[PDB]
């Protein structure tokens, strides 16, 4: 979609947020992070990793067991248990992390897309669209016209 | 603004007690809460960021909790150096708001 | 290693101006936004100022809007708190403070990692 | 007059894997796998561990005179055995249910080593000084265990004995004894052509008709003592009686309940720190919910997984240009 798509590059000079804007009013230029979506995204990712950690309910447990020379069956059984849960938690960890990694990357992608479409929702007739995901103003735009759009308050279309 | 309300305003206890503090605001500040330690005449030291994440090097006995509305700072096994005054921080949006202070005296 | 140094706290009369400063050490200063937070002597910490990494977006407290002015220097890696129209309500132990960096981005709006020693501003 | 909408990128190199593609360069990632330990046989929580040194649980519980330091210990968070822990029983013998014993000794730091049949307050006409051997050499000279008491026949006539112990300490009391299987030395040492030991309780229930044999020597010993144990509850009473071969107890161990722990086998040196989790190789932090350090752990520990890395993505596609 957006990430690795038509917005074919990130912004290294943008180091105050994940998602945001470039303005080019003929009054100045630069980068500016959209703080609302970035705060929301960080909340999401944090609740995500934190939930992956916390739902791991742990207690006090030692794994060691001594079985003598005449208890090989129960020794191999205790292995069967330990190795069993080894395999199970290995598997759930691996797949959980694969799944939610993809799901996170699409989370960012869809957030960026919703920001683009969010500004499209406001600049309908006062902007050409440029396939690198960037808007041209069909009117003259000052150093506050660039702000009204950032805070979701753009005037007559 | 957003107004923080720490409770209780002060508390005395011995070493080894289960200490409970609250930080408590108006808006939805999700988990943007930062707990700070303070010794008299000294600058703060970030204890808890993200309202649960333990700061690097801070002992595991410091713990944070709460979400959105109700916030809490819990200390499991208090130690002599932990005698201090504690401040929570709002970080959802400007301006940054702090609390009234929650000091721990000697019992 | 990493720390922030403060200076400029002195005895001053109401109505006049001062300048406090916080020099950074041990971290990429110009990559972070920064904050000035004042501990009103007797009361708790009170956020007063904050600035972005570039210095184009600046955020102030309502009590000091149009009265104080923050700035920063990349060549000197220093934080400037230029106070105008002082009054005893501004009497406070000033702290320079560093908002924390998170997963990949150096956000301005977060908890504060590193503090200065605390330089005291007295207004008689 | 243009305004662009874009996303973040930085000079990052961390790569996370997804279900549809590999080695995806991502602007930030959080690893969920603790893989660093640094040997430090830490004193988890508060209670310093117990190092048995050159001794094992046998030589520590029996009171082998080689194992004298360990007499001090009243507490420990967990027990440590080493690759040199061989000073177990000098006079050799089957510590029956030794694994069960070791498992039971896996709960808290409750010790009270206290005396029940003092060396000379409870045994008339019974030799309480011939406990000695070239097996339990306290640096050469002959000696015997520090928690058991041998009994002889005054060299020609073995009288009868029965001392019962009631529990009054209000916790579970580990009780230790032995049965001596010596006729060349049965008829000489305890004089009887017929002996028996008898341990009775509400929970332990047995006798032993002692054995005669030329068991291959160990530490220049041909006859041997079988070392037995049991647990006594509050108020309940243990009862001993024998016409021969009672290797009588001397003082036993009053345990309790609370925070249970474990036992270990490792060769590191204890230091000063804490932890919620401890391995035979060293401590680690119970904040990341996974390990690949070692399967045997003690405490509030992460899960052991066979994985090598658990890169979890937080940022987005790192696409500089
Ligand atoms: C690139 O990243 C390294 C850390 O890996 C940092 O030291 C360096 O300053 C960064 N340079 C730029 C231009 O980002």
């Amino acid at each position: 979609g957006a990430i690795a798509g038509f917005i074919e590059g990130g912004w290294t000079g943008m180091i105050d947020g994940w998602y945001g804007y470039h303005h080019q009013n003929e009054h100045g230029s630069g980068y500016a992070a959209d703080q609302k979506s970035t705060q929301i995204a960080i909340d999401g990712i944090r609740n995500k990793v934190n939930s992956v950690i916390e739902k791991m309910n742990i207690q006090f447990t030692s794994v060691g067991k001594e079985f003598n020379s005449l208890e090989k069956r129960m020794e191999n059984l205790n292995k069967k248990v330990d190795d069993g849960f080894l395999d199970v938690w290995t598997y759930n960890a691996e797949l959980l992390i694969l799944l939610e990694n993809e799901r996170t990357l699409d989370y960012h992608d869809f957030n960026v897309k919703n920001l683009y479409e969010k500004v499209k929702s406001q600049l309908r007739n006062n902007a050409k669209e440029i396939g690198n995901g960037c808007f041209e103003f069909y009117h003259k735009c000052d150093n506050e016209c660039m702000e009204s759009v950032k805070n979701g308050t753009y005037n007559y279309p | 603004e957003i107004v923080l309300t720490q409770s209780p305003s002060s508390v005395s206890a011995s070493v080894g007690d289960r200490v409970t503090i609250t930080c408590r605001a108006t808006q939805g500040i999700s988990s943007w809460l930062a707990w700070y330690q303070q010794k008299p005449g000294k600058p703060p030291k970030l204890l808890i960021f993200g309202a649960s994440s333990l700061q690097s090097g801070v002992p595991s006995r410091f713990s944070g909790s709460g979400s959105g509305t109700d916030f809490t700072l819990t200390i499991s096994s208090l130690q002599p150096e932990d005698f201090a005054t504690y401040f929570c921080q709002q970080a959802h949006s400007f301006p940054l708001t702090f609390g009234g202070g929650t000091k721990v005296e000697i019992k | 290693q990493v720390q922030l140094v403060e200076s400029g706290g002195g005895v001053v009369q109401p109505g006049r101006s001062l300048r406090l400063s916080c020099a950074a050490s041990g971290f990429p200063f110009s990559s972070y936004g920064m904050h000035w937070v004042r501990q009103a002597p007797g009361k708790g910490l009170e956020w007063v100022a904050g600035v972005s990494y570039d210095g184009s977006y600046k955020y102030y407290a309502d009590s000091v809007k149009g009265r104080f002015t923050i700035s920063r220097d990349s060549s000197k890696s220093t934080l400037y708190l230029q106070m105008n129209s002082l009054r005893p309500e501004d009497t406070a132990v000033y702290y320079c403070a560093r908002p924390s960096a998170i997963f990949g981005i150096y956000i301005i709006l977060n908890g504060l990692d590193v503090w200065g020693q605390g330089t005291t501003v007295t207004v008689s | 007059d243009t305004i662009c909408v874009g996303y973040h990128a930085n000079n990052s190199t961390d790569t996370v894997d997804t279900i549809l593609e590999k080695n995806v360069t991502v602007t930030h990632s959080v690893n969920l796998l603790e893989d660093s330990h640094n040997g430090k046989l830490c004193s988890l929580n508060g209670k310093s561990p117990l190092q048995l040194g050159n001794c094992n649980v046998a030589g520590w519980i029996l009171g082998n005179p080689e194992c004298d330091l360990l007499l001090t210990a009243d507490s420990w968070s967990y027990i440590i055995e080493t690759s040199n822990s061989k000073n177990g029983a000098c006079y050799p013998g089957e510590f029956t249910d030794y694994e069960e014993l070791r498992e039971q000794l896996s709960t808290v730091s409750s010790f009270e080593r206290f005396e029940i049949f003092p060396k000379a307050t409870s045994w008339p006409n019974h030799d309480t000084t011939k406990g000695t051997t070239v097996a339990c050499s306290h640096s050469g000279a002959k000696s015997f265990y520090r928690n058991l008491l041998w009994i002889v026949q005054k060299e020609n006539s073995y009288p009868k004995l029965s001392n019962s112990y009631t529990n009054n300490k209000g916790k579970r009391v580990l009780v230790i004894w032995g049965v001596h299987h010596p006729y060349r030395d049965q008829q000489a040492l305890y004089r009887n052509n017929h002996t028996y030991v008898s341990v009775e309780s509400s929970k332990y229930y047995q006798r032993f008709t002692p054995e005669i044999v030329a068991r291959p020597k160990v530490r220049e010993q041909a006859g041997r003592i079988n070392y037995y144990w049991t647990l006594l509850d509050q108020g309940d009473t243990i009862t001993f009686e024998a016409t021969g071969n009672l290797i009588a107890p001397w003082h036993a161990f009053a345990l309790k309940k609370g925070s249970s722990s474990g036992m270990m086998v490792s060769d590191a040196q204890v230091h000063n720190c804490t932890t919620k989790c401890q391995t035979p190789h060293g401590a680690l932090k119970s904040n990341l919910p996974f390990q690949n350090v070692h399967p045997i752990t003690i405490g509030e520990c992460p899960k052991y997984v066979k994985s090598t890395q658990l890169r979890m993505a937080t940022g987005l596609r790192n696409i500089p240009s």
Side-chain angles (χ1 to χ4, degrees), chain A residues 1-2 4-157, chain B, chain C, chain D residues 1-46 48-74 76-85 87-108 110-112 114-133 135-141 143-151 154 157-182 186-190 192-193 195-199 201-212 214-255 257-321:
Chain A
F6 62 95
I7 303 167
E8 175 162 341
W11 292 348
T12 303
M14 178 174 171
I15 56 172
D16 60 352
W18 279 344
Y19 320 116
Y21 304 110
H22 186 283
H23 75 282
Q24 188 60 255
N25 61 10
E26 293 169 351
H27 206 78
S29 68
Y31 295 160
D34 193 359
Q35 291 297 108
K36 185 74 173 179
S37 68
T38 302
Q39 297 290 318
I40 296 170
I42 298 167
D43 285 329
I45 305 299
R46 287 186 180 180
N47 191 359
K48 187 169 180 176
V49 172
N50 292 319
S51 295
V52 175
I53 297 169
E54 291 177 352
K55 298 296 181 184
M56 184 62 220
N57 192 0
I58 62 170
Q59 67 271 16
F60 195 91
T61 298
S62 178
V63 181
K65 293 294 183 184
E66 268 166 333
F67 302 105
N68 59 5
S69 64
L70 294 174
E71 290 172 352
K72 185 70 167 66
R73 292 181 296 170
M74 183 166 66
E75 183 179 2
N76 290 325
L77 186 150
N78 180 325
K79 279 188 90 292
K80 185 190 283 187
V81 175
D82 289 334
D83 292 327
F85 292 105
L86 185 33
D87 291 330
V88 174
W89 292 103
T90 298
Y91 188 78
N92 289 324
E94 295 292 331
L95 289 183
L96 182 67
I97 283 172
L98 293 172
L99 303 181
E100 293 304 331
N101 284 325
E102 185 197 9
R103 197 75 272 166
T104 299
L105 300 175
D106 286 326
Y107 176 70
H108 297 283
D109 189 359
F110 192 72
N111 290 319
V112 176
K113 185 71 176 177
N114 287 322
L115 183 59
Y116 187 82
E117 296 292 330
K118 178 260 181 66
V119 180
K120 186 193 288 187
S121 295
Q122 304 179 353
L123 296 176
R124 62 181 65 251
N125 282 317
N126 298 116
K128 290 176 72 69
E129 293 187 358
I130 298 170
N132 285 113
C134 193
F135 291 157
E136 281 187 351
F137 286 146
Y138 269 168
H139 87 301
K140 303 296 183 185
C141 183
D142 67 357
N143 202 1
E144 293 294 329
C145 160
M146 289 296 178
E147 287 293 328
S148 68
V149 66
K150 290 180 181 178
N151 202 159
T153 58
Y154 186 76
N155 286 319
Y156 75 97
Chain B
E1 291 182 354
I2 300 168
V3 176
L4 296 175
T5 301
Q6 298 182 0
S7 297
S9 65
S10 65
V11 64
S12 296
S14 296
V15 292
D17 291 331
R18 182 73 179 271
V19 176
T20 300
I21 302 169
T22 63
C23 187
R24 187 64 266 276
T26 63
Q27 291 186 1
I29 90 311
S30 283
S31 338
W32 302 100
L33 188 71
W35 286 102
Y36 294 101
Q37 183 178 2
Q38 227 163 324
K39 295 185 186 295
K42 302 291 179 68
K45 181 175 74 175
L46 189 33
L47 294 175
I48 301 297
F49 64 93
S52 68
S53 297
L54 185 64
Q55 185 62 255
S56 179
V58 175
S60 66
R61 65 184 186 269
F62 291 99
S63 67
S65 65
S67 67
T69 296
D70 297 331
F71 292 161
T72 298
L73 181 65
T74 300
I75 299 169
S76 66
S77 178
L78 192 150
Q79 291 293 320
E81 70 276 15
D82 292 331
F83 287 157
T85 300
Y86 291 158
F87 284 94
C88 63
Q89 178 184 1
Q90 181 275 127
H92 185 272
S93 66
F94 293 100
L96 297 177
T97 304
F98 293 100
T102 301
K103 188 174 182 179
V104 176
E105 290 87 5
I106 301 169
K107 182 175 174 66
Chain C
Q1 179 64 41
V2 59
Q3 68 179 358
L4 278 69
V5 178
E6 297 180 357
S7 66
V11 175
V12 67
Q13 293 177 355
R16 298 184 294 162
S17 66
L18 290 176
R19 188 184 72 186
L20 278 72
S21 295
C22 178
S25 66
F27 69 96
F29 179 79
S30 295
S31 296
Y32 288 159
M34 297 302 293
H35 293 285
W36 286 101
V37 176
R38 61 187 176 182
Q39 186 174 2
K43 293 292 187 289
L45 294 173
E46 181 178 0
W47 182 72
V48 64
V51 66
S52 65
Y53 69 96
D54 60 355
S56 297
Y57 298 100
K58 294 180 181 179
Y59 298 101
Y60 293 155
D62 288 331
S63 66
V64 300
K65 286 185 178 181
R67 191 177 71 191
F68 292 171
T69 299
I70 197 169
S71 64
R72 62 187 295 165
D73 191 358
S74 178
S75 65
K76 294 178 183 178
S77 296
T78 309
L79 185 62
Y80 297 162
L81 188 62
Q82 190 70 256
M83 292 188 288
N84 293 318
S85 297
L86 289 172
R87 65 182 182 180
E89 287 81 3
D90 292 330
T91 303
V93 176
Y94 284 176
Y95 294 96
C96 67
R98 192 188 76 185
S100 179
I102 66 97
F103 297 105
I105 51 176
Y106 294 164
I107 60 171
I108 189 169
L109 198 35
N110 191 3
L112 283 36
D113 286 333
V114 181
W115 297 87
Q117 77 276 17
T119 179
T120 302
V121 175
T122 302
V123 176
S124 179
Chain D
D1 290 330
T2 70
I3 186 165
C4 296
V5 174
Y7 56 89
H8 180 77
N10 57 8
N11 72 357
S12 176
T13 307
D14 293 331
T15 61
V16 300
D17 289 330
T18 63
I19 192 168
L20 296 181
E21 55 186 0
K22 299 293 185 180
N23 291 317
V24 176
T25 300
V26 65
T27 63
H28 183 78
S29 66
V30 174
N31 191 0
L32 297 176
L33 183 62
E34 185 68 26
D35 56 358
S36 62
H37 69 85
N38 263 18
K40 189 177 282 290
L41 283 178
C42 195
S43 67
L44 59 66
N45 289 349
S48 177
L50 185 63
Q51 278 182 347
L52 298 175
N54 63 3
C55 296
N56 61 9
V57 176
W60 168 56
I61 295 297
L62 293 172
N64 191 0
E66 285 286 325
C67 306
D68 292 336
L69 287 74
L70 301 172
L71 293 172
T72 328
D74 74 60
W76 67 91
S77 49
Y78 70 98
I79 300 167
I80 299 170
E81 287 183 350
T82 60
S83 179
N84 293 319
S85 295
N87 290 115
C90 16
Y91 209 42
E94 179 179 357
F95 212 105
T96 58
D97 296 330
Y98 180 66
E99 295 84 4
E100 288 289 326
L101 182 69
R102 295 172 62 92
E103 197 76 27
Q104 289 292 329
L105 259 330
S106 270
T107 92
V108 83
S110 285
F111 241 28
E112 199 72 28
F114 78 106
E115 193 156 0
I116 51 175
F117 309 106
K119 188 173 182 179
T121 64
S122 298
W123 303 103
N125 198 3
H126 298 166
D127 290 335
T128 61
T129 189
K130 289 292 184 181
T132 241
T133 161
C136 300
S137 297
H138 179 74
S139 295
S143 178
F144 188 72
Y145 306 121
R146 296 185 185 274
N147 291 320
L148 297 177
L149 183 145
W150 209 318
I151 293 171
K154 187 61 71 176
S157 64
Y158 194 82
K160 190 258 182 63
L161 59 89
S162 178
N163 288 322
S164 296
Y165 174 75
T166 65
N167 188 357
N168 292 317
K169 299 294 182 182
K171 293 179 179 179
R172 286 191 90 116
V173 178
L174 183 64
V175 176
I176 308 159
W177 70 91
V179 175
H180 171 294
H181 300 177
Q186 173 59 257
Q187 298 300 110
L189 288 175
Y190 300 176
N192 291 114
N193 288 111
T195 62
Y196 75 93
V197 183
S198 179
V199 176
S201 175
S202 68
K203 184 168 71 69
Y204 194 76
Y205 174 74
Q206 196 175 3
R207 73 180 298 173
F208 293 101
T209 68
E211 167 59 22
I212 293 303
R215 284 250 151 219
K217 288 185 260 74
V218 174
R219 289 178 182 265
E220 296 180 356
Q221 306 294 9
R224 275 190 253 309
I225 283 180
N226 290 320
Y227 302 108
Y228 299 160
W229 66 274
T230 189
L231 292 172
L232 185 63
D233 292 330
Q234 294 180 358
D236 195 73
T237 299
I238 190 167
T239 297
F240 293 161
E241 66 180 1
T243 63
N245 294 326
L246 176 64
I247 301 300
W250 186 32
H251 57 277
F253 300 106
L255 315 182
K257 278 149 108 165
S259 237
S260 162
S261 293
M263 193 180 294
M264 198 184 288
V265 174
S266 64
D267 294 331
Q269 177 172 355
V270 177
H271 290 83
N272 169 126
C273 54
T274 177
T275 181
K276 294 294 188 291
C277 187
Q278 172 62 41
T279 60
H281 292 172
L284 55 87
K285 297 178 183 179
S286 293
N287 57 4
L288 294 175
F290 289 104
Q291 27 147 328
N292 58 5
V293 178
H294 193 275
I296 305 299
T297 63
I298 291 174
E300 293 174 350
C301 285
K303 287 293 183 183
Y304 180 77
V305 296
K306 200 70 178 293
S307 293
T308 64
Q309 63 181 355
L310 291 178
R311 292 278 91 191
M312 183 174 174
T314 62
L316 69 164
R317 304 290 180 89
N318 191 0
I319 301 168
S321 294

